[PDB]
From Swiss-Prot:
<protein>
    <recommendedName>
        <fullName>FACT complex subunit SSRP1</fullName>
    </recommendedName>
</protein>
<feature type="modified residue" description="N6-acetyllysine">
    <location>
        <position position="37"/>
    </location>
</feature>
<feature type="cross-link" description="Glycyl lysine isopeptide (Lys-Gly) (interchain with G-Cter in SUMO2)">
    <location>
        <position position="100"/>
    </location>
</feature>
<comment type="similarity">
    <text>Belongs to the SSRP1 family.</text>
</comment>
<comment type="function">
    <text>Component of the FACT complex, a general chromatin factor that acts to reorganize nucleosomes. The FACT complex is involved in multiple processes that require DNA as a template such as mRNA elongation, DNA replication and DNA repair. During transcription elongation the FACT complex acts as a histone chaperone that both destabilizes and restores nucleosomal structure.</text>
</comment>
<feature type="cross-link" description="Glycyl lysine isopeptide (Lys-Gly) (interchain with G-Cter in SUMO2)">
    <location>
        <position position="168"/>
    </location>
</feature>
<feature type="modified residue" description="N6-acetyllysine">
    <location>
        <position position="217"/>
    </location>
</feature>
<comment type="subunit">
    <text>(Microbial infection) Interacts with Herpes simplex virus 1 (HHV-1) protein ICP22; this interaction relocalizes the FACT complex to viral genomes in infected cells.</text>
</comment>
<comment type="subunit">
    <text>Interacts with MYOG (via C-terminal region). Component of the FACT complex, a stable heterodimer of SSRP1 and SUPT16H. Also a component of a CK2-SPT16-SSRP1 complex which forms following UV irradiation, composed of SSRP1, SUPT16H, CSNK2A1, CSNK2A2 and CSNK2B. Binds to histone H3-H4 tetramers, but not to intact nucleosomes. Identified in a centromere complex containing histones H2A, H2B and H4, and at least CENPA, CENPB, CENPC, CENPT, CENPN, HJURP, SUPT16H, SSRP1 and RSF1. Interacts with isoform gamma of TP63. Interacts with FYTTD1/UIF. Interacts with SRF. Interacts with NEK9.</text>
</comment>
Length: 231
């Protein structure tokens, strides 16, 4: 029986509504049609990312190996939360257990926003810090840039030492993986900028349809971070 269960979470990747059942060594993502049992040892990284609208949060779980849904491979689990939603949790464990098990990181009875509770429980169980944005300031106080990638609109987050784009497909690129970056501008009167990244392995990523105001914030970031610009 589970330590706790988070019900009816909005998953973006893979898309659907899933319960997350929390066990000592794995989580169970349980939906109507599919389910996946995911050992914590397969979780590489955790991210908590504020949507630019200030009303939603992404929770991103990086996986290796990926989960398989037919021929589709998902290297990330992405959950989407309203900042508003609240939850009360009662861990299916006695009080003294939890203190020993989690080094005092959790208590038996907990209350808070759903996104914070999921992040806290995941943090404790995987024994990993949550990756958040650093000090990047975008346009109008957003910590991300709105852009298109592979013909889908999404959000690019400049992190302390990397970039992550959500959600279709998600992309995480560490600074140490980057060969160079470049900027290009088209002739449209809006959404005219492209930001391109080439990795050391030769892979290329283009984030396009970037507004000029956001391009300017991204430009300062890339320079502040001393990334190599190739014109
Ligand atoms: Cl523009």
């Amino acid at each position: 029986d589970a330590i706790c269960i988070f019900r009816e979470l909005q998953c973006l990747t893979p898309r659907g509504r899933y319960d997350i059942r929390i066990y000592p060594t794995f989580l169970h993502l349980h939906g109507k049609t599919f389910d996946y049992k995911i050992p914590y040892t397969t979780v590489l990284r955790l991210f908590l990312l504020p949507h630019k609208d200030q009303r939603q949060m992404f929770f991103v779980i990086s996986l290796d190996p990926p989960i398989k849904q037919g021929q589709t491979r998902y290297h990330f689990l992405i959950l989407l939360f309203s900042k508003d939603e609240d939850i009360s949790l009662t861990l299916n464990m006695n009080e003294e257990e939890v203190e020993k098990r989690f080094e005092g990181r959790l208590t038996k009875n907990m209350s808070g926003s759903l996104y914070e509770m999921v992040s806290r429980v995941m943090k404790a169980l995987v024994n990993r810090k949550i990756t958040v944005p650093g000090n990047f300031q975008g346009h109008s106080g957003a910590q991300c840039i709105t852009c298109s990638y592979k013909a889908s609109s999404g959000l690019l987050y400049p992190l302390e030492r990397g970039f992550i784009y959500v959600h279709k497909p998600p992309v995480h690129i560490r600074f140490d993986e980057i060969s160079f970056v470049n900027f290009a501008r088209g002739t449209t009167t809006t959404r005219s900028f492209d930001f391109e990244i080439e990795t050391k392995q030769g892979t290329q990523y283009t984030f396009s349809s970037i507004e000029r105001e956001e391009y300017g914030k991204l430009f300062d970031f890339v320079n502040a971070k001393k990334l190599n610009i190739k014109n």
